[PDB]
Write a protein that binds this ligand. Structure first.
Ligand SMILES: Nc1ncnc2c1ncn2[C@@H]1O[C@H](COP(=O)(O)OP(=O)(O)NP(=O)(O)O)[C@@H](O)[C@H]1O
Ligand SMILES: Nc1ncnc2c1ncn2[C@@H]1O[C@H](COP(=O)(O)OP(=O)(O)NP(=O)(O)O)[C@@H](O)[C@H]1O
Ligand SMILES: [Mg+2]
Ligand SMILES: [Mg+2]
Lengths: 431, 375, 349, 348
């Protein structure tokens, strides 16, 4: 578009020169296109839109080569300079303001069945690749091209599928879950309302899988936020414009006192996002959360919602020896062929809900026991009328160094579950 | 109005050119309308008002196609560009300043009997819809049209009234309370003095009900504010521009350090902050809704604090029963369902919140738990 | 004054045009009045004053309709537009600066016997209403007019005096204290250095009655704890009284004591220079029980006031019964007619 | 000085007009004095100084009627407007900048023997009052006038010396100590390295005495602090330009540093920390022994106890409400304190 804009600017300048000649020599000869005329030409030839009608919203420009609308003022000013090189920053701002006044308002395309990919948009319902068009309004895209794959690409005799199987310790459910996680991570408009947690201790490859995800997806498309960082100031501003968020290492057993923002982001629940000294606003984030940590951190709420939102992935394979191959995380996962094959395999995979592995269910139950002492008691206690005896301070806090209640909130245990009444029956080794 | 403003701009430019030609060549072809003349033209042909006379009060413009006065600067700038394309940001700001000096002051119409919706104004005293007029001063309207509903819409065998009953666990008192809650949610110029708290756990539909409320009200017309985040810097800055505020989630048994601001908000007692605008004091009549598990305790416990809150039970579990996702991301987004909900709720007459028996039992339980003295 | 300023501006523009004509066609036609000339005309034909010569003090203009000096730059700029509509914001700031340079310095009147009302100024020494004059300097006034009445207006058979006694547990001393509280509250330009506090019910309805007898715009909502922080005191300009609801069972004693007294305070505006200003608005705060009093000083108990609130308290009272114009006029008349010099001590507390 | 500047105005303007006339109709009648010329005229006909060469040091103007130098920008702007009304805020700022470039640098007279009051400068070395001159550099003065006196003024037949003795339980030693305390309090350039503590059980006239001591000094010359918050940050900021600090009740290293003349680290909000020396005297009143947790030699030596006990805890409400506000009693007590001279406080 540089050639077209250069030619347009040259012809407009020649026309202005001819008009000045025919009108006579009055003042200095005009040589700079007026900002209003420049904006008219840009609107006529290029494609400029406005995402909304709110206060001082930024004009968006469609990059024909990129295929995605951008709000970056630097690119727009470079295009303006292509049309008119003599305009300084103020004149470029004036041109942008005129374009904002002129162009029409179209909302962002937020269809969950459309996924922007470097080659072009991907229609999940049709399972096809459609070429880029200005009709689809996108602000970001996956940095990996979509090409048809038939044979697994092997680099230095190393197979991505075999590596995935190795990471899962040869478990079909876990590899299926991992492929599903990749597919969910690529989609930025569908959430599935589940929180992905990579739980594993020592060398396991959690970071390698996270780097693979950050490589197949755009690196700039990945946010970095640990679960405990959600609830403080300015942190949600990172989530804006990101397809997924990855927590590299959550501290072991961190106390998540506040989980409202985390729960909102996990689901499609709207939340108040605030930028640093910018007008805060309400927005909805559909990006999936993926966290890697050694052991499962415990939450203050320890209720049904945090249980149903959480998903745990096993990383039991250990490479803390000669088995460790640095090139897997340094070079192999950066291979373009491997990334393209991974993207193809993940995007072609289709499903509606995550397939929970049996091991994940076991660890989910273990986390439920650990975080909630009541359920740990209920599991450990494997009669009915005696409430004081079965209470016994949670039978001495079921030997987990927990804190008990005043035997009033303990009966919330029958919420997890003592069918109702004797009149004579109502530390200790002892049921 | 774009065509009208273009016609007036062309006519004014032609008149100025003729005056310059008859005067000679001293003016060197004046082609831009002066900002004061632009302000005069806009005031004469459009409807610009000033809500009230204080420091840095923003001009309001009546959108003829929308029927609501807006203080959005960008819209006014676009209108000015319609009148005069060649004005930059500074000249358009000059036009806005001249209009602010020129226009008269009118206060926003805050009558609990008038409710604006996409179709027009709705009057409860007479119970009918009226076309938009500049006389009615409104800053935000509900994004759902008001139409006459004869039959309850059903999609894929899913009925909105049946869904409400399922959420409410088949009790007439609680469904009446939900309908009254919705009716209060549309009306942002009146308060019922009782906070709304969707208390539940797991797949209880409180999030689905909140999403339904947001959809019927309109996404842009509702803002999300926390119960704990009621009093802090640069917060509550966009709350005034929305008809209602809902808390998506609240921590279980969360301690409240500043509930006086919360009490002022729920009761209607009177302070906004902005990046480049001085603090302004106003009352809050928008309804307050919070979704949570249990009833969080408050350090300002008293008769008034307890009576100012209302507990809405959500005792339905949708995990054992196979949940329909299309209920939450597809069904409640349908225009017909939203229109029926708006019609049914706005036609309902409001006097006070009809307290269900289950709500009374949960209120008594919370009273016993928060204050052991009574128990 | 809009017609006067319009006529003056038209006359000045015509005179400038004639002066340019007699000098011949030299440059472009002068069509806008220079800001210095506008400032001269405004100073001659209007009343502009300066409260004090402090750093970056703001010009005050006498509103003839209201009778009170105001520092609102928007109203002043509207007056500028009346005189000269072609001046943008910068030229209006320039003319305001010139006026600030020219105008005389006068101190705000703080006579206890003079209290501004929407109808006029009430003098307690003669107990009489007088028309507005620029000679008296006021910054705020009551928005309920003062009228002469001899009866107690009754709406739906409701008596204000009996209701006040019901709230006050039916004691003469406490109801007299309540009337004195009203009298102190409506005085926005004079202060007794007493910080009114509400301890309790019926407190909310009485607070709303106070907020209604005074103009709502004249009321500023602030708590004691929030006086100190930056960019919070600027809302106290031109306010007759400041009423707040401090947390129940929660009290510094910095600038709160300063605003309670007539002492100047360094008030600040966003993106505007700071300046020293004096606020004499009556301070009212509501809470259940005694304030915390972290300071625990005798002078604090000396300055503040405690008003007991004990009752068995009905949505009707809230609307149209305390917002009635007749009720507000009656309570204003009764409170302003009461004459006192020292505060009373109720027998119920 | 408005008349002088007005006379200077439209006289340089006439000179510019006639220069333009003799040069021909080419300047379009320049009727506005250039900012540099305004600075020249102001420097020639007024007294503008600069306190120090610090960054962004504000120009100071000598108010002839007031007798003290001021950095108030508004007054300087008014003076410039008197010279030439047709100046923007930017043009007047340019005039101020040119003056700042022109004027000489002078240091404020911080002599402990010189005390400024509304009538003039009092020198303790000569024990004499001198008229206001631009040679002396003062940024503040005591608002109570100083005149020669021969009798004790009385309001409603009430004495000041009798009242002070009644507060001081009628003992000559403690009365002399109170007079010395006032003398040290008014002097803002000398400390005596003693912290005066008022120990009592109730009012005893200590509150009204502190109110009187605040009244005799300027309104803005007094600071309010308690012991507990000397260690807390940003609390030193209130001592930027004060002459003394007085508390009311007491419900340690920084406090000890403030008591003596050794420098302390003052921190301003959104401003780098800097060390400064405070010569203001500290006076604290409280009920009983003030709280302390660093009992040692330095604290004991630095503290001075002035017990207060009487029946005032008659409540002396008439004395506090209006009697101390009378100008006669204020000038009397100021004169009595200024005449009194001593070297150090006397232990009761
Ligand atoms: N299948 C594999 N076989 C051998 N080495 C592997 C394999 N997968 C990953 N690695 C290597 O093992 C290391 C994994 O490091 P990384 O993934 O950052 O941390 P982690 O194992 O998740 N946790 P930690 O050990 O605490 O740092 C890197 O050197 C990888 O290249
Ligand atoms: N009547 C219904 N029948 C079937 N599914 C339903 C029904 N009502 C709601 N659901 C589904 O149940 C889920 C409830 O929505 P959700 O927002 O997760 O609830 P919630 O009560 O906010 N959960 P939580 O935050 O854990 O307390 C959604 O998937 C709904 O589509
Ligand atoms: Mg790692
Ligand atoms: Mg929810």
């Amino acid at each position: 578009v540089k050639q077209l804009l250069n030619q347009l600017g040259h012809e407009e300048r020649t026309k202005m020169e001819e008009n000045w000649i025919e009108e006579g020599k009055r003042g200095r000869k005009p040589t700079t296109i007026s900002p209003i005329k420049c904006a008219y030409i840009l609107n006529e030839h290029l494609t400029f839109i406005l995402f909304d009608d709110e206060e001082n919203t930024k004009l968006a420009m469609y990059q024909f080569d990129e295929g995605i609308y951008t709000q970056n003022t630097t690119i727009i000013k470079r295009v303006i300079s292509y049309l008119e090189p003599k305009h300084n920053s103020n004149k470029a701002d004036e041109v942008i303001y005129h374009l904002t006044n002129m162009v029409d308002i179209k909302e962002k395309t937020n269809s969950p069945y459309l996924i922007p990919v470097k080659n072009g948009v991907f229609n999940r319902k049709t399972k096809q690749l459609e070429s880029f068009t200005p009709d689809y309004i996108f602000t970001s895209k996956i940095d990996t091209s979509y090409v048809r794959q038939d044979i697994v690409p092997e680099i230095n005799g190393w197979n991505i599928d075999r590596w995935i199987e190795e990471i899962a310790c040869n478990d079909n459910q876990v590899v299926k879950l991992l492929w599903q996680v990749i597919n969910d991570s690529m989609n930025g408009n569908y959430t599935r309302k589940k929180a992905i947690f990579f739980v594993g201790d020592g060398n396991n490859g959690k970071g390698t899988f996270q780097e693979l995800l950050s490589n197949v997806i755009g690196y700039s498309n990945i946010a970095s936020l640990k679960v405990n960082e959600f609830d403080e100031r300015f942190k949600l501003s990172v989530l804006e414009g990101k397809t997924a968020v990855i927590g590299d290492d959550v501290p072991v057993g961190v106390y998540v006192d506040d989980s409202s923002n985390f729960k909102s982001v996990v689901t499609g629940d709207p939340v108040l996002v605030e930028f640093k000294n910018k007008p805060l606003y309400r927005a909805t984030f559909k990006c999936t959360v993926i966290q890697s940590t050694n052991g499962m951190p415990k939450f203050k709420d320890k209720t049904g919602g945090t249980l149903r939102r959480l998903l745990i992935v096993p990383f039991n394979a250990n490479f803390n020896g000669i088995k460790e191959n640095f090139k897997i995380k340094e070079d192999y996962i950066k291979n373009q062929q491997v990334l393209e094959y991974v993207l193809y395999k993940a995007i072609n995979l289709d499903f509606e809900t995550f397939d929970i592995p049996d091991a994940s269910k076991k660890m989910l139950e273990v986390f439920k026991e650990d975080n909630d002492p009541v359920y740990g008691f209920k599991v450990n206690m494997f009669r009915k009328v005696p409430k004081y005896i079965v209470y016994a301070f949670y039978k001495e806090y079921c030997d987990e160094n927990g804190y008990n209640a005043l035997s009033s909130n303990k009966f919330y245990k029958q919420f997890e579950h003592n069918y109702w009444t004797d009149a004579q029956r109502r530390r200790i080794y002892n049921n």
